[PDB]
Amino acid sequence: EQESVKEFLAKAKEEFLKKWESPSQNTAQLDHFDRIKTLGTGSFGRVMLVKHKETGNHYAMKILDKQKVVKLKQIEHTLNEKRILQAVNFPFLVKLEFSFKDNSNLYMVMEYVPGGEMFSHLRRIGRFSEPHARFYAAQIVLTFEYLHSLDLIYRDLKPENLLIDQQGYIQVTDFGFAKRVKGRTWTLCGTPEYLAPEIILSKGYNKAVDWWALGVLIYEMAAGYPPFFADQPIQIYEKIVSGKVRFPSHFSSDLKDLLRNLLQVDLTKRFGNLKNGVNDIKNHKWFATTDWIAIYQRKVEAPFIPKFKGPGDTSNFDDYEEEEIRVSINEKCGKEFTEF
Ligand SMILES: O[C@@H]1CNCCOC1
Ligand SMILES: O[C@@H]1CNCCOC1
């Protein structure tokens, strides 16, 4: 690798480790914010558009219910998410601005990206052209080069987690499955369509699962549907482990070749996991037109700018029932979340 890249990644790792070893804590409180609108909701948390009452800035506030985190055995994952997010710094990662906890909940206050999820745009447009898919893919390649150099596995690559910003660039959100891993890890996590075979088969797996997921993402962006699509998870898993993938005839030969090497069921043969690491991907013919430095510097004109009216516009997000942010009079699960 060019010494320029080595020295960049060495500095990136130094800066990450300093924050990793001494995490920030308790940098805002709930009553500093007005709630605006629920942007997403799940089994143990929600994401809320909020506005800071003094500065007027908008943020996406992820709120996790401590009792539900415990019940669903997600404690370590939530601690991973916050400790990692407060320590990273890269152009295509959403920034954590504040974090805090109270008697009931954990809070991560992130930048708000009003352009919405790639998922919505992809489903509205049908499929992306190869140049359009390649622009997004290149950002993920660089983001994974960064994260993996810090010994971080992301483990949740899917279109819903890629927000499109005001310049048309990606910002990766949701670090709920991200983990610092030297070697292997074992947790079953990730959306069915994106799971690598070694996860399905309950093996000790490594960063190669992220490169598999990139193959799935590129296929889905360029085709409009994922490669192992089926109606129930069991049938999806059978397809994933089979070693077979079919490509639309509109795919270029270069795209097919790259995808065969990312969607390699033998993890010891999978691009991103060989002796040349990420460079087997960056040097592949499908990326021949990609100016990696210009992408990193955000100097490439993006495929499209999402339509939105301003930093408080929620039009590109969905409508959800609005529920209270209740804070118990009594502290819940204090011991489990001491480090948050
Ligand atoms: O945030 C984690 C990963 N993303 C999907 C929802 O599950 C929890
Ligand atoms: O600690 C083990 C692995 N980490 C996540 C799931 O909980 C059990």
- Provide DSSP, 94-154: PPEEEEEE-SSEEEEEEE--TT-BHHHHHHHHSS--HHHHHHHHHHHHHHHHHHHHTTEE-
Structure determined via: X-ray
Q: Which residues pair with 106 in a beta bridge?
A: 64, 101
Write down the residue that tokens 């118990």 correspond to: 328
Cβ–Cβ < 8 Å for 306, 171? no
Write down the residue that tokens 């089979």 correspond to: 242
Cβ–Cβ < 8 Å for 112, 95? no
Cβ–Cβ < 8 Å for 192, 158? no
Question: In a 10 Å sphere around its CB, with 0-12 CB exposed, 13-18 middle and 19+ buried, how is residue 173 labelled?
Answer: buried
The whole-angstrom separation of Cα 138 and Cα 296 is 9
Shortest-distance Cα residue to atom 1 of ligand 1: 176
The whole-angstrom separation of Cα 185 and Cα 76 is 13
Reading phi first (left if > 0) and then psi (alpha if -120 to 50, else beta), residue 119 is in alpha
Cβ–Cβ < 8 Å for 178, 153? yes
DSSP-assigned letters across all residues of 18-60: HHHHS-------GGGEEEEEEEEE-SSEEEEEEEETTT--EEE
Q: Which residues pair with 164 in a beta bridge?
A: 170
Write down the residue that tokens 């909701």 correspond to: 41
Radius of gyration of the chain (CA): 20
Write down the residue that tokens 């049938």 correspond to: 235
DSSP-assigned letters across all residues of 242-306: TT-----TTS-HHHHHHHHHHS-SSGGGSTTSSTTTTHHHHTSGGGTT--HHHHHTT-SPPS-PP
Resolution (Å units) = 1.2
Say yes or no: CB of residue 187 within 6 Å of ligand 2: yes
Name residues whose C-beta falls within 8 Å of residue 165's C-beta, 6 or more positions apart in sequence.
113, 115, 171
Cβ–Cβ < 8 Å for 106, 86? no
Give the distance (Å) from ligand 2 centre to CA of residue 188.
9
Return phi, psi of residue 49, to 5°: -70, 125
Q: Which of 156, 193, 199, 210 to mutate to test the pocket of ligand 1 (most atoms within 8 A of CB)?
A: 156
CB neighbours of residue 3 within 10 Å: 7
Q: Which residues are annotated as a binding site for ATP?
A: 39-47, 62, 111-117, 158-161
Give the distance (Å) from ligand 2 centre to CA of residue 187.
6
Q: In the chain, what are the domains? A: 1-22+117-307 (1.10.510.10), 23-116+308-340 (3.30.200.20)
Say yes or no: CB of residue 76 within 6 Å of ligand 2: yes
Give the distance (Å) from ligand 1 centre to CA of residue 177.
6
How many CA atoms lie within 13 Å of 65's alpha carbon, on the beta-carbon side?
A: 16
